[PDB]
Amino acid sequence: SFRKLLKMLIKTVVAFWSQTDSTRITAFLVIRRLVVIGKAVRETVLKASYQGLVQGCRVTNANTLSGINLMKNSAAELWGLDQNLGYTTAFTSIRQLAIHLRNSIINNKNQAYRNVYNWQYVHSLDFWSCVLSEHCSSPLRPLIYPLVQVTLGAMRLIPTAIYFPLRFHLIRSLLRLSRATDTYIPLASALLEVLQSAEMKKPPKSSTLKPLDFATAYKTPKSYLRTRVYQDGVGEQVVELLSEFFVLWSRNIAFPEFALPTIVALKRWMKEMRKGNKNAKLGSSLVVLVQKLEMNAKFIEERRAKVDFAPKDRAQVDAFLKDLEWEKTPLGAYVVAQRKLREERKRLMEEARREEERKRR
Amino acid sequence: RIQSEILKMVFATYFRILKARVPHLMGAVLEGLAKYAHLINQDFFGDLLEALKDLIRDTDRDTSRESLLCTVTAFALLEGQDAHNARSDLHLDLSFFITNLYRSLLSLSLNPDLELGNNKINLQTTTVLLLRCLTSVLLPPWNIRSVPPIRLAAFCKQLMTLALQVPEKSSQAILGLLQDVVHTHGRKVAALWNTEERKGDGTYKPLSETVEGSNPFTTTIWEGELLRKHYCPKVREGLKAMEKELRSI
């Protein structure tokens, strides 16, 4: 009676979720009502909505990327309202992700890398990353470690030129988590192997195709193998993610000790490109990023040179730059300039396609 | 006589495999070289050191694995007791290998294949290979209270940087290794954590070509503010053990 009526009601609401924007808002409001009213009913609701979101990311994303994002940040504060039982369900769900990853790694026979690399796993990692990011700043906090574990496992399963975009997307998710929390996630490594790929090292191939959108790609077209367009695209992705990572950690006391390895690695790559590849745009972009890194390292060194770090007292250390904000630094200036340029390019192409559709109509 | 002949055949195979550079034989052949060079003559032992040297050079011009393998073989060979006593009379110097390790720590930090893996040489993991390298250099089994403090400090700071930019299990490995080095040496390195003991006789040079060229006492360890917030709880526990020992020094 009671439980059955509740489960068919939520099944109808999950179908509404599976369905446009007005339905999104109404079904989410109903879900909000359900979770607020609610213990066992609450865990059932969150579980069912969990598989509902799983299916919603199971279907596709070519234009419903908007819908998937909205579904995700709507689903987040359900688990924010639930906490404890939500924490247990997160534990078991990350466990099942981990067991999938592990048994695929064990029996990598046939397409285990395929039943791992999909949209479901990517969007699931994004879902818990954003949930924890929004709701950790408790009991759900000490769960980031397994999430980072499975994410890095997904990174190093099979990092090929075909599978570049997926690790770009999940490094985006990891950077979101790092921005929200105060946890350090080493991703400069992965960005440096993407740099030390053979795809961008070899000279490009002249072709004329459409710049691929890094918001709906889980593979690469067989045409996009040596294409200069794909070369450039992974170029701005590397540049952008490196920028977010280093501006994300652009205020800590130990920046020079944290960046020079990457700085000299990128120097070595720039020499190897100019002793190979011929992409002047990428060369100039990476070089100018190198000068920003040198400048901010000098800045933090100068502002650190007169502070005390005694082993029994870290006072200026625990009050180093609490009154500084992330646009005062040279990376702050560069990254705001880059968000302005990136957004104006986004608008350029978005309108361009809209008037193209209008002309075709 | 039979021993001499069998050494002849075994070491002939060893060096011709080395010149063939068969990638899957390196670990075993280097293990054999390390464990029989003490019975091989002294002049041939020095020839083995310079053969290790120019193999490292050829790798300079996978590659990290080969470099670390030759490095660990060099340390094992010179940490053998007979070669230990032969040292000065035989003119056996490790400075080139020390400089190679110091200049390659950064690439070892930023390369991906670190953790894709009773033996003393043929170890499948570059992490444990680097661990043996650093144990040999920082805590050699002999004359533990004679290690140059400048080398100690430079390796300590570069190891902290590696810890910031290395995968998690390797991170905890070097955290424990630095726990060991601060337990053993202590006062020799404490200036690298105390700022009022910082030397003001120059500026720290990160990209040095030599360990003494890198002036290590002009800078202090600042890596705690990153390692305390590194995502791995085990890394955080290793770090807090580090500062606990530093404070209890």
Side-chain angles (χ1 to χ4, degrees), chain B residues 30-169:
Chain B
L30 294 174
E31 181 65 26
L33 297 169
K35 67 184 289 184
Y36 301 107
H38 68 278
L39 294 174
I40 301 297
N41 301 325
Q42 320 86 38
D43 55 304
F44 294 158
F45 179 73
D47 302 341
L48 293 174
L49 278 72
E50 291 181 353
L52 280 190
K53 194 190 298 295
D54 63 349
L55 304 166
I56 297 169
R57 278 206 207 74
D58 210 316
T59 55
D60 294 341
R61 43 196 166 91
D62 193 51
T63 60
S64 56
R65 284 172 41 53
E66 284 144 16
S67 55
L68 293 176
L69 272 161
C70 315
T71 303
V72 295
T73 54
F75 292 102
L77 280 179
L78 276 296
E79 293 295 329
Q81 183 283 359
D82 282 281
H84 186 273
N85 296 115
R87 193 92 53 62
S88 304
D89 302 276
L90 276 297
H91 298 104
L92 309 157
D93 291 331
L94 278 297
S95 55
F96 169 83
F97 310 91
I98 303 293
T99 44
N100 204 67
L101 199 81
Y102 182 82
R103 291 178 70 167
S104 67
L105 293 174
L106 198 152
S107 291
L108 295 171
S109 311
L110 278 73
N111 63 7
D113 299 334
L114 289 171
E115 293 206 319
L116 289 163
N118 72 301
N119 206 288
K120 294 181 176 67
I121 299 298
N122 190 27
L123 295 172
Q124 298 323 108
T125 300
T126 70
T127 312
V128 75
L129 285 190
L130 171 142
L131 288 176
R132 303 281 330 299
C133 291
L134 277 296
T135 58
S136 69
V137 65
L138 303 181
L139 282 72
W142 320 78
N143 314 287
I144 187 166
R145 306 173 194 266
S146 81
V147 181
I150 291 308
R151 191 181 318 142
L152 272 193
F155 283 40
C156 277
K157 184 175 175 66
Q158 296 305 109
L159 266 185
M160 303 281 319
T161 296
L162 191 144
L164 277 68
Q165 186 173 355
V166 68
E168 61 184 0
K169 296 183 290 294

Side-chain angles (χ1 to χ4, degrees), chain A residues 144-249:
Chain A
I144 311 186
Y145 178 39
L147 188 153
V148 177
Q149 275 160 272
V150 294
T151 304
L152 281 162
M155 296 311 127
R156 304 276 307 138
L157 183 63
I158 192 66
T160 190
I162 303 167
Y163 287 128
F164 285 173
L166 61 84
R167 67 184 184 273
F168 292 103
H169 294 105
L170 283 66
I171 293 166
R172 294 248 163 80
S173 66
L174 283 155
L175 284 170
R176 166 208 297 127
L177 183 63
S178 304
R179 279 185 173 178
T181 54
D182 57 356
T183 64
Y184 163 54
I185 301 299
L187 296 175
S189 56
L191 294 174
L192 276 296
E193 293 84 4
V194 176
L195 202 70
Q196 299 288 113
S197 296
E199 175 262 337
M200 183 179 72
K201 190 186 290 183
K202 304 303 160 312
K205 193 55 209 64
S206 189
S207 72
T208 55
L209 287 173
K210 53 165 206 55
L212 182 143
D213 292 331
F214 269 47
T216 181
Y218 80 107
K219 293 293 280 193
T220 61
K222 301 304 115 184
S223 199
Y224 289 165
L225 183 59
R226 304 283 112 180
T227 54
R228 185 189 288 268
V229 189
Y230 160 54
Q231 295 287 292
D232 282 303
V234 299
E236 70 274 15
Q237 311 289 289
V238 169
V239 170
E240 180 207 58
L241 282 71
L242 268 172
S243 176
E244 282 102 13
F245 182 76
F246 282 85
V247 65
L248 201 170
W249 295 119

Side-chain angles (χ1 to χ4, degrees), chain A residues 58-137 139 142 144-313:
Chain A
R58 282 222 71 199
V59 295
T60 190
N61 46 286
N63 175 37
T64 186
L65 55 89
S66 49
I68 62 170
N69 320 289
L70 281 71
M71 181 156 68
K72 213 163 291 303
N73 49 319
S74 56
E77 68 275 16
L78 279 67
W79 281 48
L81 288 154
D82 75 12
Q83 293 82 17
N84 192 315
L85 71 165
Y87 163 59
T88 65
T89 48
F91 182 76
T92 187
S93 66
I94 297 160
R95 198 190 325 97
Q96 66 91 29
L97 294 198
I99 193 66
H100 183 306
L101 188 54
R102 188 179 68 85
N103 64 7
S104 315
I105 293 161
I106 295 161
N107 56 98
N108 201 3
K109 295 180 177 67
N110 285 318
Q111 313 333 310
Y113 82 98
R114 293 310 330 191
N115 64 7
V116 177
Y117 278 167
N118 63 7
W119 293 98
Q120 299 94 27
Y121 188 76
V122 169
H123 293 286
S124 82
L125 276 296
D126 194 73
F127 173 56
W128 292 272
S129 69
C130 62
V131 163
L132 277 296
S133 76
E134 201 183 88
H135 297 164
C136 303
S137 59
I144 311 186
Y145 178 39
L147 188 153
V148 177
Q149 275 160 272
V150 294
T151 304
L152 281 162
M155 296 311 127
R156 304 276 307 138
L157 183 63
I158 192 66
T160 190
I162 303 167
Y163 287 128
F164 285 173
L166 61 84
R167 67 184 184 273
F168 292 103
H169 294 105
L170 283 66
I171 293 166
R172 294 248 163 80
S173 66
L174 283 155
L175 284 170
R176 166 208 297 127
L177 183 63
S178 304
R179 279 185 173 178
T181 54
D182 57 356
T183 64
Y184 163 54
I185 301 299
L187 296 175
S189 56
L191 294 174
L192 276 296
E193 293 84 4
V194 176
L195 202 70
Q196 299 288 113
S197 296
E199 175 262 337
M200 183 179 72
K201 190 186 290 183
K202 304 303 160 312
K205 193 55 209 64
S206 189
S207 72
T208 55
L209 287 173
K210 53 165 206 55
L212 182 143
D213 292 331
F214 269 47
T216 181
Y218 80 107
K219 293 293 280 193
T220 61
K222 301 304 115 184
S223 199
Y224 289 165
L225 183 59
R226 304 283 112 180
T227 54
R228 185 189 288 268
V229 189
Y230 160 54
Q231 295 287 292
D232 282 303
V234 299
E236 70 274 15
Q237 311 289 289
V238 169
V239 170
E240 180 207 58
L241 282 71
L242 268 172
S243 176
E244 282 102 13
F245 182 76
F246 282 85
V247 65
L248 201 170
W249 295 119
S250 66
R251 286 86 60 71
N252 199 274
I253 206 164
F255 200 108
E257 296 84 5
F258 172 74
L260 311 174
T262 72
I263 297 169
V264 304
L266 183 60
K267 279 155 174 37
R268 290 180 293 174
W269 182 257
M270 182 295 307
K271 279 73 176 175
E272 212 272 324
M273 297 289 94
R274 278 75 171 176
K275 290 291 185 181
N277 194 356
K278 264 65 189 152
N279 205 347
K281 293 162 73 173
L282 303 186
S284 49
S285 68
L286 277 296
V287 166
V288 71
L289 183 63
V290 173
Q291 292 83 18
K292 274 80 71 175
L293 294 174
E294 287 169 288
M295 306 187 202
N296 65 7
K298 288 304 301 155
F299 177 81
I300 178 64
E301 182 65 26
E302 182 65 26
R303 298 289 209 289
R304 88 192 307 177
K306 326 197 283 283
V307 305
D308 192 1
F309 184 67
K312 198 171 315 307
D313 186 63

